[PDB]
Design a binder for this molecule. Structure first.
Ligand SMILES: CCCCCCCCCCCCCCCCCC(=O)OC[C@H](COP(=O)([O-])OCC(O)COP(=O)([O-])OC[C@@H](COC(=O)CCCCCCCCCCCCCCCCC)OC(=O)CCCCCCCCCCCCCCCCC)OC(=O)CCCCCCCCCCCCCCCCC
Ligand SMILES: CCCCCCCCCCC(CCCCCCCCCC)(CO[C@H]1O[C@@H](CO)[C@H](O[C@@H]2O[C@@H](CO)[C@H](O)[C@@H](O)[C@@H]2O)[C@@H](O)[C@@H]1O)CO[C@H]1O[C@@H](CO)[C@H](O[C@@H]2O[C@@H](CO)[C@H](O)[C@@H](O)[C@@H]2O)[C@@H](O)[C@H]1O
Ligand SMILES: CCCCCCCCCCCCCCCCCC(=O)OC[C@H](COP(=O)([O-])OCC[N+](C)(C)C)OC(=O)CCCCCCCCCCCCCCCCC
Ligand SMILES: CCCCCCCCCCCCCCCCCC(=O)OC[C@H](COP(=O)([O-])OCC[N+](C)(C)C)OC(=O)CCCCCCCCCCCCCCCCC
Ligand SMILES: CCCCCCCCCCCCCCCCCC(=O)OC[C@H](COP(=O)(O)OCCN)OC(=O)CCCCCCCCCCCCCCCCC
Ligand SMILES: CCCCCCCCCCCCCCCCCC(=O)OC[C@H](COP(=O)(O)OCCN)OC(=O)CCCCCCCCCCCCCCCCC
Ligand SMILES: CCCCCCCCCCCCCCCCCC(=O)OC[C@H](COP(=O)(O)OCCN)OC(=O)CCCCCCCCCCCCCCCCC
Ligand SMILES: CCCCCCCCCCCCCCCCCC(=O)OC[C@H](COP(=O)(O)OCCN)OC(=O)CCCCCCCCCCCCCCCCC
Ligand SMILES: CCCCCCCCCCCCCCCCCC(=O)OC[C@H](COP(=O)(O)OCCN)OC(=O)CCCCCCCCCCCCCCCCC
Ligand SMILES: CCCCCCCCCCCCCCCCCC(=O)OC[C@H](COP(=O)(O)OCCN)OC(=O)CCCCCCCCCCCCCCCCC
Ligand SMILES: CCCCCCCCCCCCCCCCCC(=O)OC[C@H](COP(=O)(O)OCCN)OC(=O)CCCCCCCCCCCCCCCCC
Lengths: 78, 494, 85, 101, 85, 74, 75, 85, 39, 186, 81
């Protein structure tokens, strides 16, 4: 006469499928290929139009010159 | 402050809190383990944030910080696609490894947590440093904590295991260091964006390859240089084993993508047949000995050797799919070996106190939840499709075949033999009769803790086995940069 | 069956190597033109895989031993559908 | 032609895909060249992927008749398959070649 | 319908297996047999659509493995052989 | 005749309830919560894959040849 | 016996003794004609054979886009 | 590779009905050998020729014997050597 | 025994106008029998 | 050319002389009143073993140069390989014969290949700034220079690869390469 | 008879002779869930299927009643003369 409840795993599976359907639908770009309100935020925050290249170039040249100086000091004539 | 420095700083903060909170509150050890776990969660949250901002098709290192204060040894941090997934693997594995030892560490709990937190910082720094000598410094830094971790928390043979892993790794690494120092002398630095533009002459490349290869074959490990792993991965505490097989084996693989492919292309291509003979021999020999291994944790440890042979052959394939498959297999091995070590070193071992296969049989009858996850993990170890293990094995094996067909054909035999030892070990433990008559007490099934570390690991392998694009899409552009060769009508355009 | 799976994998590897991918339309559209020795390598490879799943004399021994399962399994899996793969 | 998207232009190479007349001490210019060689190889590769897609549709459209009606795509895909491959920039960065040799 | 043939036997299997305690013996048999019989009717309908009218059906959902030249999709083709099998 | 479904989930005997070891909060809410949030965040992440950029140029070049029809002819 | 209390196991002394012999067997290896021959075969001969075959067939074949009127051989 | 025209028209009628002649006769031969004779097969079985024939076919050409001896046990002994020596 | 006694082919090979050459893929592919050497 | 026997005798003398010195120290350090003639009675084998090894070393290296008509590092390897075998011959165990041979052969060959600074080094006597400068920015080389050492194939197909392979394939298999066309209309 | 077994073993598939008293109610919910997922899969299929020949008007082709590709063709073909 014991009854077996559906259980928490039922709601995770059913809820996860339902949530996946809902989240996928609201995240679509819409009828036109126009980014949504949230799409523009993620594109804006991770912009780095030239930041990595600028910093990387400055560091590469500096360690280039530093190697130059050590080569000069290490190969100096006795 | 860079997000990459935050990644290295959070675990040090947790170490500080663990070591000082006795002065603000006998504090319960639950509080200590709560601090360490939340520390790993925040480190994982930061790595997820980095990945959301990360760009998949940039050949500039991302999230770097300008120094402008040059010294003799400065830590420069940067990330690209060939390192971003190893950072994610380290930050996902570390919380699971902490929960897997929540109850089994009974003495010296503060020391255990501080070592694991320090291991997190050091292993992460290996993936993020932008200098070749910085790579050696972080690669070798993990040895003293690993020596102490094994010796304070290991099983009966912990002393011999601790010595083996320390002396093997040191010996191999000393040959890598001599290779790195030669590079540093010719070029003037080991910063990546400078050394990768250098062109070493062919004979220099050959002797540079030897010395870097000796170290990476000790760390892969290749068969015959692998007794340190068969000791250390078994005698280690469970959290140590997960870290040692999920992240520490991956160091030699990520090391190939920084230290051999861009700067030793001619030596790598000319020596691939030596690499492939060793990798082929390792695939067969390790497979046959895994079939005859009677320690359950040693059997899972030996299968790591066979899988690492395939990613090593994929990394020397000089093809896009072989290189991406190598990274895919490395990652898939991290989830699967973590789960199989939890099943053996954490579920069987805690319940029985023994690791001998002769005492186990028919566990499915009383432990259905364990047998369900254990079986799925054993299919992952056999590279069954729908796991990320099939995707990595297939792509790695295809690249090895296309580079050198006889080596790929022998390496392909792993599809037969990995199934053999995985299915044999599963059948003897979960199936193979009624419940073993050596068990006096009955056994409880998985606790909620055991269930949710296995479920989480099994979730990652299956989700990525169905949509491996979640890693490949961020791999394609950067991994193009390590391929060596030309097409006749595609090259030298004008 | 895993022995036959290993040969099917190498045959897929040979298709990928020669044709660039393994969708049916591509393979079947290019088959008349590919090197005849390549067709043999792929063909023999997928024949050996077929031998194991359809229990031909080389790789047959599993199917008689598969009668150890419950009877409706033999009718469905080992007689009518999977043996025909 | 399909208009070049805003996202596409953000990653379009400003330099030709070559290493000739590139000062390797100029970090920015060298990485720009490397990006151009890499991107050009992928375009040729993605071209083959699109040809294969068209060949797939005609095969399932012409059925029995595919051996006669799909030859033009058939030839195109084989040409791309014989020529397009992501080979990296690093051989061409380290090895200069001349036509007059 | 063409996708519904693929997923319906899988759906019944996960209810029978991962929620057997919920449906019991009779619930498991009702769900699996129902989910296989309904799939069989759709297969008979498919055999008429694809085979008798000679209309093959292509369906691609999401890519599985995408590396340079290899693009493998979660994709299904129904042709005369498919519905015959 | 059938039996009532029995068994102790997580080994909790029918009299008692599950006791928290202290890991459940951080693991379910921090570890799994963050992964779920990241997955939602990943739906809105812009595509920066080399394929997407290269497919668009490949389409234009095959539009240039007599392979693909041009939506915007001249 | 090892940290946490585990369940009661009928630890069979023969099986335990067999497990101890396997852990300590390295201490009793000796060079004999048999062991040297086996060790030389597994470590030298078979690997050098695969190495020689891999060497001699390196670059021999390529399958990519090979049609009728062409050869798989490259060398 | 077409043969169907020759199969329909070029095959002599004797070879077309030969299976049915054999089927309708060995069924008589088999049904008569039992329930009517029943000692002849016994005489064959208890001959050394028949005994060996009976055992060979009952033991499935001895393939499982030779597979187990020289493939499966060969691999297990290779692993034994690798682990021990 | 079969090799000694197996009947000769009892029909001339079927011929195809043009050898179905275009519909079998052109001269690059394999074609059908067309006024070729006898067999 | 060189005299293997004459050079080997000198080798035995130099290291036998050192062995005789170590023989004298053992005799001097003896506790019992054995005498001055203990040099060849008790410790005599030590001096003989040393003369045997260094003689064997100088003989076999000198012979190795004569047989190969070359003067390179290898000869110091076989010389050490033979000297190490002679060292192990005294023990009477075959594994010690091989292992001692291997160590002596490897150590002595490694020293000769790298030119150990035990007595001097290969002085460059050149501009070290120019040496490191040239190796540092030799970023791009002529392609032929690479091809001369890795070759063609294995993914290295420089422009004109197909024409050469066509030529190569004809010279070996006697087959002209004419790939078929996939387009019936050509 | 029926085999004895431990009552402490919890298995997701039920165990040994497992049938809850409420099995019909639970089966009804799960069957409803199965219908709901199947319908979503049906909707996806009817929109994303691809054909290269359409069925003739007089032939039994029930997909013509839900598949977007054929529904558009039939609606457009009705505009004749
Ligand atoms: C990951 C994606 C999917 C991966 C698929 C992987 C496929 C392979 C695995 C398949 C095998 C599944 C394992 C068997 C589980 C079901 C049977 C069982 O043994 O139940 C044991 C048992 C369930 O028994 P129960 O009686 O129903 O639950 C009561 C327990 O006491 C439980 O009580 P509880 O209170 O502890 O349960 C809650 C627990 C659950 O923990 C989690 O939810 C974390 C995992 C996330 C799931 C997504 O933790 C929490 O407290 C949740 C708090 C955090 C919620 C999220 C916060 C959001 C904040 C941000 C917004 O374990 C579970 O709770 C399972 C939970 C997870 C189920 C996932 C869905 C299972 C679907 C099965 C088929 C899937 C494959 C389909 C084909 C492909
Ligand atoms: C085992 C791992 C080695 C560790 C990595 C070595 C790092 C590079 C050293 C290799 C080394 C000796 C190798 C001797 C044998 C090695 C040990 C033998 C077996 C040991 C048990 C190559 O030395 C060779 O270099 C060649 C040119 O590259 C020359 O040609 C040779 O004449 C020269 O002998 C030393 O040369 C190195 O110094 C620089 C100076 O600026 C040279 O420029 C390079 O030459 C560079 O390489
Ligand atoms: C290129 C690399 C190719 C290598 C090819 C050969 C492979 C050899 C690998 C050597 C590196 C690992 C050595 C591990 C030795 C550890 C060990 O023996 O047990 C320690 C042992 C543990 O053994 P134990 O735990 O079983 O029992 C001893 C008990 N205690 C520790 C209390 C004494 O601990 C010790 O400290 C005792 C060692 C005494 C001295 C032994 C030194 C040997 C080290 C050799 C290194 C030489 C390198 C030269 C090359
Ligand atoms: C490949 C990795 C896994 C990916 C797929 C993940 C699962 C997807 C859903 C699979 C179908 C649903 C399976 C239901 C589980 C079976 C019944 C059950 O609950 O077992 C518990 C049962 C409980 O059985 P019980 O309910 O009869 O309880 C009494 C029985 N004893 C005595 C044991 C307690 O445990 C077992 O008895 C068997 C243990 C092994 C379980 C086998 C795993 C089943 C899933 C196979 C995965 C299929 C992979 C596909 C291949 C990949 C494709 C290339
Ligand atoms: C052994 C297991 C093997 C598993 C193999 C993996 C599956 C591959 C084989 C089956 C393929 C079928 C997959 C379903 C295809 C359709 C997916 C779908 O649900 O699409 C609907 C939804 C919106 O559709 P949309 O893409 O927006 O179309 C408009 C575009 N302009 O799109 C969505 O985003 C909704 C996504 C919700 C999840 C999809 C439904 C999943 C159904 C399968 C669940 C099985 C597990 C059941 C768990 C227990 C349930 C009781
Ligand atoms: C860089 C950051 C600093 C490096 C790590 C140093 C950490 C020191 C802070 C900890 C201070 C402390 O109080 O630790 C106490 C703990 C044991 O003490 P306690 O808990 O009080 O004992 C109770 C007995 N019932 O003792 C411990 O927890 C220490 C545990 C051992 C330390 C890690 C293992 C050694 C690792 C190698 C150390 C040497 C190399 C340094 C490596 C740094 C990284 C490269
Ligand atoms: C299980 C079925 C899950 C539902 C899959 C259908 C939802 C969907 O439409 O997503 C498709 C999305 C875009 O498709 P894409 O992979 O980029 O390439 C298409 C080439 N055919 O690609 C995706 O993002 C699909 C991601 C699949 C993740 C499956 C995880 C399964 C977990 C169990
Ligand atoms: C249940 C709850 C569980 C936890 C929920 C969190 C899980 C999140 C997983 C996915 C994260 C996505 C959210 C996100 O995208 O954050 C973006 C955030 C804002 O970006 P922005 O302001 O432009 O900073 C640029 C700095 N270079 O980027 C950032 O810069 C955020 C900076 C975070 C710094 C952390 C500092 C240490 C934290 C301890
Ligand atoms: C038909 C051609 C047979 C040639 C005769 C070969 C022969 O001499 O075999 C004799 C053998 C006798 O059987 P045996 O057990 O040795 O008798 C014991 C007597 N003390 O009897 C046999 O071995 C007969 C072998 C029967 C099984 C052979 C495999 C099937 C052969 C198909 C025909
Ligand atoms: C490079 C290093 C070369 C090896 C140096 C050490 C080798 C050596 O000196 O000989 C030792 C070893 C003798 O082994 P063995 O005496 O039989 O072992 C008895 C243990 N009680 O000798 C050996 O076992 C080495 C025999 C194989 C040598 C192949 C090279
Ligand atoms: C159960 C056993 C099933 C076995 C199936 C095996 C498949 C191969 C069997 C071959 C049998 C061929 C079908 C026999 C009947 C064919 C037929 O013509 O039936 C008539 C019916 C109406 O067709 P219609 O074209 O509209 O006729 C009027 C035209 N002015 O045409 C039809 O469409 C009626 C058939 C309905 C199909 C759905 C049946 C669902 C069950």
């Amino acid at each position: 006469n014991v009854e077996e409840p559906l259980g928490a795993a039922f709601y995770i599976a059913v809820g996860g499928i339902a949530s996946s359907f809902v989240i996928y639908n609201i995240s679509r770009p819409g009828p036109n290929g126009e980014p949504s309100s949230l799409h523009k935020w993620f594109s804006k925050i991770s912009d780095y139009k030239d930041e990595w290249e600028t910093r990387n170039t400055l560091m590469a040249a500096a360690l280039e010159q530093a190697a130059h100086d050590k080569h000069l000091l290490l190969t100096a004539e006795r | 402050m860079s997000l990459l420095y935050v990644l290295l700083i959070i675990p040090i903060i947790g170490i500080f809190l663990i070591s000082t909170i006795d002065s603000f509150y006998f504090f319960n050890v639950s509080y200590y383990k709560k601090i360490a776990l939340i520390t790993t969660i925040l480190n994982l949250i930061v790595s997820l944030i980095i990945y959301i901002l990360f760009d998949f098709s940039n050949n500039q290192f991302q999230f770097i910080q300008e120094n402008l204060d040059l010294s003799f040894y400065d830590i420069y941090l940067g990330v690209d696609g060939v390192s971003i997934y190893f950072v994610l693997l380290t930050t996902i594995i570390m919380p699971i490894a902490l929960v897997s030892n929540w109850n089994s560490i009974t003495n010296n709990i503060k020391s255990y947590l501080i070592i694991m937190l320090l291991l997190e910082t050091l292993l992460l720094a290996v993936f993020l440093v932008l200098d070749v000598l910085l790579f050696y410094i972080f690669f070798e830094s993990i040895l003293p904590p690993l020596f102490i971790l094994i010796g304070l928390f290991g099983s009966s043979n912990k002393v011999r295991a601790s010595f083996y892993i320390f002396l093997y790794t040191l010996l191999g690494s000393l040959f890598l260091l001599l290779s790195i120092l030669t590079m540093s002398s010719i070029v003037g630095t080991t910063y990546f964006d400078v050394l990768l533009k250098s062109s070493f002459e062919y004979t220099t490349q050959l002797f540079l390859f030897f010395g870097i290869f000796i170290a990476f074959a000790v760390k892969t490990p290749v068969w015959g240089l692998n007794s340190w792993l068969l000791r250390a991965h078994v005698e280690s505490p469970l959290g140590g084993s997960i870290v040692l097989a999920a992240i520490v084996l991956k160091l030699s693989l990520y090391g190939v993508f920084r230290l051999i492919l861009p700067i030793l292309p001619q030596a790598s291509l000319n020596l691939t047949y030596i690499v492939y003979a060793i990798g082929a021999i390792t695939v067969l020999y390790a497979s046959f000995s895994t079939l005859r291994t009677v320690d359950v944790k040693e059997l899972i440890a030996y299968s790591s050797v066979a899988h690492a042979a395939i990613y090593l052959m994929g990394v020397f394939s000089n093809t896009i799919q072989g290189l991406e498959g190598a990274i895919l297999l490395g990652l898939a091995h991290g989830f699967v070996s973590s789960g199989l070590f939890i099943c053996a070193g954490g579920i069987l071992y805690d319940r029985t106190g023994t690791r001998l296969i002769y005492f186990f049989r028919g566990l499915t009858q009383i432990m259905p939840l364990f047998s369900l996850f254990f079986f799925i993990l054993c299919l992952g170890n056999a590279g069954t499709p729908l796991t990320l293990n099939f995707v990595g094995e297939f792509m790695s094996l295809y690249g090895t075949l296309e580079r050198l067909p006889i080596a790929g054909m022998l390496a392909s035999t792993s599809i037969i033999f990995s199934a053999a030892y995985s299915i044999y070990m599963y059948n003897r433990i979960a199936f193979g009769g009624s419940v073993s008559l050596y068990f006096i007490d009955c056994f409880r099934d998985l606790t909620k803790r055991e269930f949710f570390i296995l479920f989480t690991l099994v979730s990652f392998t299956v989700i990525l086995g169905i949509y491996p694009s979640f890693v490949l899409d961020g791999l394609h552009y950067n991994i193009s940069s390590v391929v060596y060769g030309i097409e006749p009508n595609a090259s030298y355009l004008t | 069956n895993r022995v036959g799976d290993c040969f099917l994998t190498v045959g897929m590897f040979a298709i990928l190597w020669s044709l660039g991918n393994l969708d049916y339309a591509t393979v079947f559209s290019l088959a008349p033109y590919i090197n005849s020795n390549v067709v043999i390598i792929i063909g023999i490879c997928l024949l050996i895989g077929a031998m194991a799943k359809s229990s031909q004399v080389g790789l047959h021994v599993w199917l008689p031993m598969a009668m150890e399962g419950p009877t409706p399994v033999s009718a469905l899996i080992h007689a009518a559908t999977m043996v025909t793969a | 032609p399909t208009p070049e998207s805003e996202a596409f232009l953000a990653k379009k190479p400003q330099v030709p895909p070559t290493f000739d007349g590139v000062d390797y001490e100029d970090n920015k210019r060298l990485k720009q060249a490397q990006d151009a060689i890499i991107r050009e190889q992928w375009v040729q590769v993605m071209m083959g992927r699109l040809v294969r897609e068209e060949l797939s549709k005609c095969y399932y459209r012409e059925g029995v008749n595919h051996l006669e009606k799909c030859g033009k795509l058939r030839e195109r895909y084989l040409q791309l398959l014989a020529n397009a491959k992501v080979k990296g920039y690093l051989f061409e960065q380290q090895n200069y070649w001349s036509k007059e040799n | 319908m063409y996708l519904s043939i693929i997923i319906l036997p899988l759906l019944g299997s996960v209810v029978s297996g991962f929620f057997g305690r919920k449906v019991g013996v009779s619930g498991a048999q009702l769900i699996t047999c129902s989910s296989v019989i309904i799939t069989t009717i759709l297969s008979i309908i498919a055999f008429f659509e694809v085979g008798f009218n000679n209309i093959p059906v292509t369906i691609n959902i999401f890519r599985w493995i995408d590396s340079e030249w290899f693009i493998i999709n979660w994709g299904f083709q129904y042709d005369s052989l498919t519905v015959s099998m | 005749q059938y039996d009532p479904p029995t068994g102790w989930l997580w080994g909790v005997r029918p009299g008692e309830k599950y006791q928290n070891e202290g890991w459940e909060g951080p693991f379910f809410y921090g570890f799994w919560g963050s992964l779920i949030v990241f997955a939602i965040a990943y739906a809105y992440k812009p595509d920066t894959s080399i394929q997407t950029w290269a497919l668009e140029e490949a389409r234009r070049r095959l539009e240039a040849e007599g392979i693909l029809e041009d939506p915007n002819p001249t | 016996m090892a940290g946490l209390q585990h369940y009661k196991i009928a630890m069979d002394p023969a099986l335990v003794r067999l497990g101890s012999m396997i852990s300590n067997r390295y201490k009793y290896f000796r060079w004999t004609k048999r062991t040297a021959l086996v060790s030389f075969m597994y470590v030298v001969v078979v690997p050098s054979t695969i190495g020689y075959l891999a060497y001699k067939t390196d670059g021999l074949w390529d399958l990519r886009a090979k049609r009728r009127g062409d050869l798989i051989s490259e060398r | 590779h077409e043969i169907m025209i020759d199969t329909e028209f070029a095959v002599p009628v004797l070879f077309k009905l030969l299976p049915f002649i054999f089927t309708i006769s060995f069924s008589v031969i088999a049904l008569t050998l039992s329930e009517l004779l029943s000692e002849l097969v016994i005489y064959f079985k208890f001959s050394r020729f028949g005994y060996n024939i009976f055992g060979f076919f009952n033991q499935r050409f001895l393939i499982e014997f030779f597979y187990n001896k020289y493939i499966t046990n060969l691999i297990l002994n290779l692993g034994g050597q690798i682990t021990k020596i | 025994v079969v090799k000694l006694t197996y009947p000769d082919r009892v029909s001339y090979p079927r011929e195809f106008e043009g050898g179905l050459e275009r519909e079998l893929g052109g001269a690059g592919a394999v074609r059908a029998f067309l006024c070729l050497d006898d067999e | 050319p060189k005299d293997a026997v004459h050079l080997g005798l000198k080798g035995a003398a130099v290291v036998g002389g050192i062995g005789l010195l170590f023989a004298a120290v053992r005799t001097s350090l003896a506790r019992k009143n054995v005498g001055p003639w203990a040099i060849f009675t008790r410790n005599g084998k030590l001096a003989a073993t040393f003369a045997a090894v260094g003689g064997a070393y100088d003989f076999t290296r000198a012979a190795a140069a004569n047989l190969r008509e070359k003067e390179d590092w290898v000869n110091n390897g076989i010389g050490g390989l033979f000297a190490g075998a002679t060292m192990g011959l005294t023990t009477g165990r075959i594994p010690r014969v091989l292992g001692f041979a291997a160590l002596t052969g490897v150590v002595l060959a490694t020293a000769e290949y790298a030119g150990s600074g035990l007595r001097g080094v290969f002085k460059r006597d050149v501009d070290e700034y120019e040496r490191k400068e040239f190796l540092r920015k030799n970023r791009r080389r002529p392609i032929e220079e690479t091809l001369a050492e890795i070759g063609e194939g294995r993914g290295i197909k420089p422009p004109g690869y197909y024409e050469r392979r066509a030529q190569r394939l004809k010279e070996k298999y006697g087959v002209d390469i004419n790939p078929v066309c996939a387009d019936p209309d050509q | 008879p029926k085999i004895p077994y431990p009552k402490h073993v919890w298995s997701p598939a039920g165990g040994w002779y497992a049938q809850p008293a409420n099995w019909k109610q639970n089966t009804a919910i799960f069957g409803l869930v199965i219908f709901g997922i199947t319908a979503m899969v049906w909707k996806y299929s009817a929109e994303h299927e691809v054909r290269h020949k359409m069925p003739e008007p007089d032939r039994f082709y029930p997909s013509r009643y839900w598949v977007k590709q054929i529904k558009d063709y039939e609606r457009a073909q009705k505009e004749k003369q």
